[PDB]
Amino acid sequence: APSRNGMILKPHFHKDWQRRVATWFNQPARKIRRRKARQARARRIAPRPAAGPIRPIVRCPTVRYHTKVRAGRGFSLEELRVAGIHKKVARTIGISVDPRRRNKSTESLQANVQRLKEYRSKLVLFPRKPSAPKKGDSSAEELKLATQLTGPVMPIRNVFKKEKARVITEEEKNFKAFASLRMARANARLFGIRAKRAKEAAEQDVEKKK
Amino acid sequence: PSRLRKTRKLRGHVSHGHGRIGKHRKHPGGRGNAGGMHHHRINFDKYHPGYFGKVGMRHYHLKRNQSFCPTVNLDKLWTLVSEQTRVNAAKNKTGAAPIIDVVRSGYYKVLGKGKLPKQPVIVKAKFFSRRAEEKIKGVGGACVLVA
Amino acid sequence: GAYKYIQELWRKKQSDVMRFLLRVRCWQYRQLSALHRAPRPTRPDKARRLGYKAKQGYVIYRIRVRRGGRKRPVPKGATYGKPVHHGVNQLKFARSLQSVAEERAGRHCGALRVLNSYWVGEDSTYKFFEVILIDPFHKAIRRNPDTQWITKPVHKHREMRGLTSAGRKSRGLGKGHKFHHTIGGSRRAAWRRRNTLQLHRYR
Amino acid sequence: ALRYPMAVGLNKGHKVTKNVSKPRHSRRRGRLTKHTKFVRDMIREVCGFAPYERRAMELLKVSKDKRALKFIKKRVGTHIRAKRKREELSSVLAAMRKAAAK
RNA sequence: UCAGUAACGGCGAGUGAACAGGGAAGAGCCCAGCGCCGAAUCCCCGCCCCGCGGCGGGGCGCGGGAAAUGUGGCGUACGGA
RNA sequence: CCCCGGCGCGCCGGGCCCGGGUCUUCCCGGAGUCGGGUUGCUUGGGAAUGCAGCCCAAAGCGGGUGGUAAACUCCAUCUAA
RNA sequence: ACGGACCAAGGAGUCUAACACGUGCGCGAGUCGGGGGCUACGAAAGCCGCCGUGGCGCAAUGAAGGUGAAGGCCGGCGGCG
Ligand SMILES: [Mg+2]
Ligand SMILES: [Mg+2]
Ligand SMILES: [Mg+2]
Ligand SMILES: [Mg+2]
Ligand SMILES: [Mg+2]
Ligand SMILES: [Mg+2]
Ligand SMILES: [Mg+2]
Ligand SMILES: [Mg+2]
Ligand SMILES: [Mg+2]
Ligand SMILES: [Mg+2]
Ligand SMILES: [Mg+2]
Ligand SMILES: [Mg+2]
Ligand SMILES: [Mg+2]
Ligand SMILES: [Mg+2]
Ligand SMILES: [Mg+2]
Ligand SMILES: [Mg+2]
Ligand SMILES: [Mg+2]
Ligand SMILES: [Mg+2]
Ligand SMILES: [Mg+2]
Ligand SMILES: [Mg+2]
Ligand SMILES: [Mg+2]
Ligand SMILES: [Mg+2]
Ligand SMILES: [Mg+2]
Ligand SMILES: [Mg+2]
Query: CA of A24 and C1' of G32: distance in angstroms?
Result: 21
Helix (H) or strand (E) holding C198: strand C197-199
Half-sphere exposure in the Cβ direction for B51 (13 Å, CA): 16
3-state secondary structure of B146: coil
Q: Which bases of strand G have any atom within 7 Å of the beta carbon of a protein residue?
A: 13-20, 30, 34-39, 43-44, 50, 54, 58-59, 63-70
Query: Which chain A positions have a beta carbon within 8 Å of D10's beta carbon?
Result: 184, 187-188, 191
3-state secondary structure of C54: coil
3-state secondary structure of B97: strand
Neighbouring C-beta atoms of residue C148, cutoff 10 Å = 12
Neighbouring C-beta atoms of residue B126, cutoff 10 Å = 20
Q: What is the DSSP letter of C134?
A: E
User: Would you call A22 and C199 a contact, using CB atoms and an 8 Å cutoff?
Assistant: yes
Instruction: Show Cβ contacts of residue D16 under 8 Å, excluding neighbours closer than 6 positions.
Output: A104, A105, A106, A107, A108
Q: Is the minimum distance from the CB of A88 to strand E below 7 Å?
A: yes
Instruction: Show Cβ contacts of residue A101 under 8 Å, excluding neighbours closer than 6 positions.
Output: A58, A72, A73, A74, A75, A76
Tell me the shortest Cα–Cα distance from A46 to chain D, in angstroms. Answer: 37
Q: Judge whether B100 and B77 are in contact, CB under 8 Å.
A: yes
Q: Judge whether D9 and A187 are in contact, CB under 8 Å.
A: yes
Query: Which chain D positions have a beta carbon within 8 Å of C14's beta carbon?
Result: 50-52
Q: Judge whether C57 and C141 are in contact, CB under 8 Å.
A: yes
Neighbouring C-beta atoms of residue C146, cutoff 10 Å = 8
Query: CA of A49 and C1' of E28: distance in angstroms?
Result: 20
DSSP per position, C85-132: G---SS---SS-HHHHHHHHHHHHTTTSEEEEEEEEEE-SSEEEEEEE
d(CA B109, CA B71): 5
Ligand 18 centre to CA of C170 (Å) is 15
Across the A:B interface, residue pairs with CB atoms under 8 Å apart total 84
Q: Which bases of strand F have any atom within 7 Å of the beta carbon of a protein residue?
A: 20-21, 27-33, 35-37, 39-46, 49-65, 67-68, 70-72, 77-79, 81
Query: Which chain A positions have a beta carbon within 8 Å of B137's beta carbon?
Result: 173
Q: What is the largest CA-CA distance in chain A?
A: 93
Nearest to A137 by CA among A149, A150, A148, A128: A128
One-letter amino acid of B111 = L
Q: Are strands B96-97 and B71-73 parallel, antiparallel or unpaired?
A: unpaired
Question: E strands along chain B, which residues?
Answer: 71-73, 96-97, 99-101, 109-111, 122-125, 127-128, 142-145
Nearest to D68 by CA among D49, D85, D51: D85
- Cβ-in-10-Å burial (0-12, 13-18, 19+) of C166 comes to buried
Instruction: Show Cβ contacts of residue C29 under 8 Å, excluding neighbours closer than 6 positions.
Output: C62, C64, C120, C121, C126, C128
Query: Which chain D positions have a beta carbon within 8 Å of C8's beta carbon?
Result: 39-40, 43
Binding-site residues on chain B for chain D (CB distance < 8 A): 108, 126-127, 144-147
Helix (H) or strand (E) holding B133: helix B130-138
Ligand 19 centre to CA of B38 (Å) is 27
DSSP per position, chain A: ---SS------S-SS-GGGGEEE-TTHHHHHHHHHHHHHHHHHHHTTS-SS-SB--EEE-SHHHHTT-EEE-SSB-HHHHHHTT--HHHHHHTTB-B-TT----BHHHHHHHHHHHHHHHHH-----SBTTB--SSPPPHHHHHT-----SSSS-----------EEPPHHHHH--HHHHHHHHHHHHHHHHHHHHHHHHHHHHHHHHH-
d(CA A112, CA A83): 9
Strand E-proximal residues of B, range 67-86, CB below 7 A, are none
Instruction: Show Cβ contacts of residue A162 under 8 Å, excluding neighbours closer than 6 positions.
Output: none
Ligand 8 centre to CA of C94 (Å) is 6
The nucleotide lying nearest B18 (C-alpha to C1') is G13
Beta bridge partners of C133: C59, C114
Among the bound ligands, name the one nearest to the CA of residue A61: 13
Handedness of CA C68, C73, C78, C80 (dihedral sign): negative
What values do phi and psi take at A200, rounded to 5? -65, -45
In the complex, which subunits touch C with 3 or more CB pairs below 8 angstroms? Answer: A, D
Ligand 4 centre to CA of C33 (Å) is 75
Q: What is the largest CA-CA distance in chain B?
A: 86
Which residues numbered 7-36 in D keep a CB inside 8 Å of some CB on C? Answer: 36
End-to-end CA distance of chain B: 56
Cα dihedral D79, D85, D86, D87 in deg (nearest 10): 110
DSSP per position, C83-94: GGG---SS---S
Among the bound ligands, name the one nearest to the CA of residue C172: 10
- List the single protein residue with the shortest CA to C1' distance from G13: B7
**Helical H segments across B11-129, by residue range:** 41-47, 83-91, 102-105
User: Would you call C200 and A15 a contact, using CB atoms and an 8 Å cutoff?
Assistant: no
Query: CA of C44 and C1' of E70: distance in angstroms?
Result: 10
Packing angle of the helix pair C16-30, D34-47 (nearest 10 deg):
70
Q: Which bases of strand E have any atom within 7 Å of the beta carbon of a protein residue?
A: 2-8, 11-35, 42-44, 56, 65-72, 77-79
Query: CA of A127 and C1' of F62: distance in angstroms?
Result: 51
Tell me the shortest Cα–Cα distance from C198 to chain A, in angstroms. Answer: 5
Nearest to B126 by CA among B92, B97, B103: B103
d(CA A63, CA B67): 8
Which residues numbered 34-63 in D keep a CB inside 8 Å of some CB on A? Answer: none
d(CA C173, CA C184): 10
Handedness of CA A70, A73, A79, A80 (dihedral sign): positive
Ligand 2 centre to CA of B13 (Å) is 7
Beta bridge partners of A132: A129
CA A110 to chain centre: 14
Query: CA of B81 and C1' of G66: distance in angstroms?
Result: 30
Ramachandran assignment for D48, one of left (phi > 0), alpha (psi -120 to 50 degrees), beta (any other): left
Instruction: Show Cβ contacts of residue C12 under 8 Å, excluding neighbours closer than 6 positions.
Output: C18, D43, D47, D48, D50
3-state secondary structure of C65: strand
What values do phi and psi take at B144, rounded to 5? -120, 130
Half-sphere exposure in the Cβ direction for B106 (13 Å, CA): 3
Nearest to A165 by CA among C198, B136, B120: B120
Burial A31-59, CB ≥16 within 10 A → b, else e: eeeeeeeeeeebeeeeebbbbebbbbbbb
Q: What Å distances lie between residue B48 and A1, A10, A174, B31, CA to CA?
A: 14, 15, 50, 18
d(CA B87, CA B65): 37
Query: CA of B124 and C1' of E12: distance in angstroms?
Result: 51
Query: Which chain B positions have a beta carbon within 8 Å of A6's beta carbon?
Result: 47
d(CA A148, CA A126): 13
CA C87 to chain centre: 27
DSSP per position, C7-53: HHHTT-TTSHHHHHHHHHHHHHHHTS-SEEEESS-SSHHHHHTTT--
Q: Is the minimum distance from the CB of B60 to strand E below 7 Å?
A: yes
User: Would you call A187 and D24 a contact, using CB atoms and an 8 Å cutoff?
Assistant: no
Q: Judge whether C65 and C100 are in contact, CB under 8 Å.
A: yes
Instruction: Show Cβ contacts of residue C17 under 8 Å, excluding neighbours closer than 6 positions.
Output: C9, D46, D47, D48
DSSP per position, chain D: ------SSSTT-S----BPP-PPPGGGGTTPPPHHHHHHHHHHHHHH---HHHHHHHHHHHTT-HHHHHHHHHHHH--HHHHHHHHHHHHHHHHHHHHHHH-
Q: Judge whether C142 and C136 are in contact, CB under 8 Å.
A: yes
Closest alpha carbon within chain C to A21: C197
Ligand 3 centre to CA of C156 (Å) is 64
Cis preceding linkage at A47, omega within 30: yes
Q: What is the 3-state secondary structure (H, E, C) of A94-122?
A: CECECCCCCCCEHHHHHHHHHHHHHHHHH
Burial A109-126, CB ≥16 within 10 A → b, else e: bebbbebbeebeeeeeee
